[PDB]
Each structure stands twice: as structure tokens, then as C-alpha cells.
Amino acid sequence: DPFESYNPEFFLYDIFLKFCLKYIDGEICHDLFLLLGKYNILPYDTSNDSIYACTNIKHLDFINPFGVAAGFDKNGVCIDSILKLGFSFIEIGTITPRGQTGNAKPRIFRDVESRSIINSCGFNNMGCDKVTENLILFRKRQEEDKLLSKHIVGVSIGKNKDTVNIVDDLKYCINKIGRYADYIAINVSSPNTPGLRDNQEAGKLKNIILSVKEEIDNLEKNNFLWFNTTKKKPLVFVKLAPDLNQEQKKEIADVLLETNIDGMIISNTTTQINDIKSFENKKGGVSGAKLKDISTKFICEMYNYTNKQIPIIASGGIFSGLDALEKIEAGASVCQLYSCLVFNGMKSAVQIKRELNHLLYQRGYYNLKEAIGRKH
């Protein structure tokens, strides 16, 4: 009930959301969100997640199939509050070895009528050292909090603006924060770091994945060890860009199979949406509803190109339970949200979980795992 108690669907946060989306700068609303979470003002979802909507990627056991995508909590300043809204996992970052301010503001803009966002942030983050300290503090609180014992935390890693070879920055981050991550997400798909997406070329991508895997394996040798949720070394995911041709996607699939990567995040923002009058002026990558179809088709292609052997984390225009089921039936095992929290507020997780559960029931699925890839 929106009015009777304090909970994710509390009516006042919807009043706030309407005021924010109409009058307040996008990045300012997001900072206010994080401040409320940093001081544990936001409401909790203490509901038991349905046993039939759980999912997994190898040993990662997601209590439910909805997490928060990278770029929402870049520095891990309110990991607890975001998770407690009802999410099973969060991807902090993307982080860089040293801190950097990013591109000039304003750099985030929303189109409410199309439920779309465009951003040109440029990997703004406090730096690997400080974000590592932020994550360690969460891991210590997690061991005591019975609401977070099974929640998953991944770390997205990139490179600083003036780094020549990306692997040098990735290796630094892994040795600093890898011990506290349940998985590592390699960001070679940001459209706001010039030249980053070139690293999706098969040759460079293979070298990057293998270098990241070796550094994670070296953490074990060089060094209680795994202060994370799984108590195992982090898995390795790659986050891919949607603006690729079929031959690019096929050679990427061959690399992902050859390197035994643990999963792929499909996908990052697109630069190929010029349908939004309000974004005419603007630079950066686009998120939200206008990315949904692009991202779902991309999931179908990679699911087939990898012969269903690489688990998929879905990202792009997921707002409703039907949207999530589309991603799942396309080949995704788990979903990430971002734009949904921007346009629907604190109730995003509670609402979408209920919609998905009622849909799996309406469609005749016994559980979510049964729906993975059923479109094929």
C-alpha cells in the first residue's frame, strides 16, 4: 500500500519522482538518490523472493533475477540501500585505477516521453583505492546483516582517460579489489571513452580476457582470501556494445568461447538512436526504452553465435515484467536495471518482481530457469 506504511512503493517517493523528472537536473537527482541511500533513509523490501524466480550463473546464486547495472553506484557509496530495495545484485563502477572527474556537465539528459537517457559521463569515479575501501566496508557489514547474506556484488573495471594499454589498468584494479568481488565485468563497450570499443576486436579482446583471467588466478597464488559472497575467486564477464556488425559479433563469439569467459553482459548504451528530438544536440550513449529492441536482438544473436554456452546478463530498456521475460526467453539468465530506477523510482524492484512472477505463472512456466532461451 502506497499510503499506509513506509515501503518501496511509498506514495511520497512517487510525488518526489514526478517533481524530479520535470524540474531537476538528471545528475542532481541521481546524487540525491545516492545521498538518501548513503544515510539509510530509503525503504527496504524484506519480502521472501519467490523460489521459482531464482537463477544462477555457474556458482553465483541470485536470490532473484534483477540487479542494478554498472554506472548507478559508480563508487559503491550506498551498496546496502540499493540492494535492500529488492535487488539480488549490483555492479559497482565502472572504476579506474586513479580517480578522475569525467567530462564537463551537464552530461546526463532524460527524455521522459520516450523513457530514454543519454549520457557522456566519461568514467567519473573516485578511483580504485577509495572504491575498494568502500566495498570492504560493505563486506564487513554484510557478514552481520541477515538481509544481505546472499546478495551478489560485481565490479566493473575500465581505464583512465590517458592510459595507453587498457590491460595495465585492468590488472591494477583486479589486484586491488578482486578479492572482494563476486565477479569482474570488463568494460570495453563505453561509448564515452574514445577508442575503448576498439578493444572488442577479436585479437585485442582475447588478450584482454586472458590477461584478466591470469591476474585473478595470480591473486590466489600471491596471497580469508575471498572476502566476497561466493567465497570463490570472482567470475569474469565482458560487457559488449550494441553497435556492431554481424561479422564483428561472430568473431567476438568465437573469442568468448575460446577463452572460457564466464558470461557476457548484453549490452551497453547505443550511439545509433537519433529518433529523440530532445537529444538532437547531445553527445554520448543512449539508454532506456529506445535501446530495448536493439539489446534483445543482440541477445538472440550472441546466444546463437555462442551455441548457448555463455551465460548472458541482460541490460537495455528493461522496465516491466514482460520486458524481463523477453530478455530471458531470448537467452538471458539474469537482468540488470538502470533506466527503470530513473523513471519508476524506489518501487522498481518490488514491482518488476511481482510482474515477472505473475507472468511466469500466466505463461505456464514452472520456474524462471525453464524460460531461459525458449524463444529458440
Ligand X SMILES: Cc1cc2nc3c(=O)[nH]c(=O)nc-3n(C[C@H](O)[C@H](O)[C@H](O)COP(=O)(O)O)c2cc1C
Ligand Y SMILES: O=C(O)c1cc(=O)[nH]c(=O)[nH]1
Catalytic (active site) residue 116: no
Cell numbers standing for residue 326: 523477453
Does the protein bind ligand X through residue 155 (CB under 6 A)? no
Cell numbers standing for residue 260: 572460457
Any binding-site annotation on 259? Answer: no
Closest CA to 343 of 333, 351, 335: 351
Question: In terms of CB distance, is 132 or 187 closer to ligand X?
Answer: 187
Cell numbers standing for residue 88: 539480488
Q: Which of residues 254-293 bind ligand Y (CB under 6 A)?
A: 268-269, 285
Q: Name which of ligand XAJ, ligand Y, ligand X, none residue 192 binds, using a CB cut-off of 5 to 8 Å depending on partner kind.
A: ligand Y
State the Cα–Cα distance between residues 27 and 64, nearest whole angstrom: 28
Mapped onto helix, strand or coil, the DSSP state of residue 143 is coil
State the Cα–Cα distance between residues 190 and 314, nearest whole angstrom: 16
State the Cα–Cα distance between residues 240 and 186, nearest whole angstrom: 9
Mapped onto helix, strand or coil, the DSSP state of residue 275 is coil
Q: Assign residue 244 a region: left if phi > 0, alpha if psi is -120 to 50, beta otherwise?
A: beta
Q: Which of residues 288-327 bind ligand X (CB under 6 A)?
A: 288, 291, 315-318
Q: Which of residues 27-86 bind ligand Y (CB under 6 A)?
A: 71
Strand partners, 110: 117
Does the protein bind ligand XAJ through residue 341 (CB under 6 A)? yes
Question: In terms of CB distance, is 88 or 94 closer to ligand Y?
Answer: 94
Does the protein bind ligand X through residue 122 (CB under 6 A)? no
Q: Which of residues 121-160 bind ligand Y (CB under 6 A)?
A: 121-123
Q: Name which of ligand X, ligand XAJ, ligand Y, none residue 346 binds, using a CB cut-off of 5 to 8 Å depending on partner kind.
A: ligand XAJ
What is the separation of C-alpha 259 from the centre of its chain, rounded to a whole number of angstroms? 22
For ligand X, which stretch binds (CB under 6 A), given 70-78, 199-207, 297-305, 346-354? Answer: 70-78
Does the protein bind ligand XAJ through residue 291 (CB under 6 A)? no
Neighbours of 4 (CB within 10 A): 8
Residue of 81, 116, 156, 190 with catalytic role: 190
Does the protein bind ligand X through residue 338 (CB under 6 A)? yes
Q: Which of residues 180-239 bind ligand Y (CB under 6 A)?
A: 187, 189-190, 192
- Using CB positions, name the residue nearest to ligand X: 71
Question: 342-357 burial string, b = 16+ CB within 10 Å, else e?
Answer: bbbbbbbbbbbbebbb
Closest CA to 216 of 181, 255, 175, 182: 175
Residues 6+ apart with CB under 8 A from 243: 191, 197, 270, 271, 272
Any binding-site annotation on 20? Answer: no
Does the protein bind ligand X through residue 156 (CB under 6 A)? yes
Q: Which of residues 112-141 bind ligand XAJ (CB under 6 A)?
A: 117
Q: In 145-214, which ranges are E strands?
A: 152-157, 183-187
Does the protein bind ligand XAJ through residue 305 (CB under 6 A)? no
- Contact present, 301 and 329 (Cβ < 8 Å): no
- Which residue ranges make up the site for ligand XAJ (CB under 6 A)? 13, 16-17, 20-21, 26, 29-30, 32-33, 36, 108, 110, 117, 341-342, 345-346
- Which residue ranges make up the site for ligand X (CB under 6 A)? 69-71, 74, 93-94, 108, 117, 119, 121, 156, 187, 239, 268-269, 287-288, 291, 315-318, 337-340
Detail the residues annotated as belonging to a binding site.
70-74, 94, 119-123, 187, 192, 239, 268-269, 287-288, 315-317, 338-339
Q: Which residues are catalytic?
A: 190
Detail the residues annotated as belonging to a binding site for substrate.
74, 119-123, 187, 192, 268-269
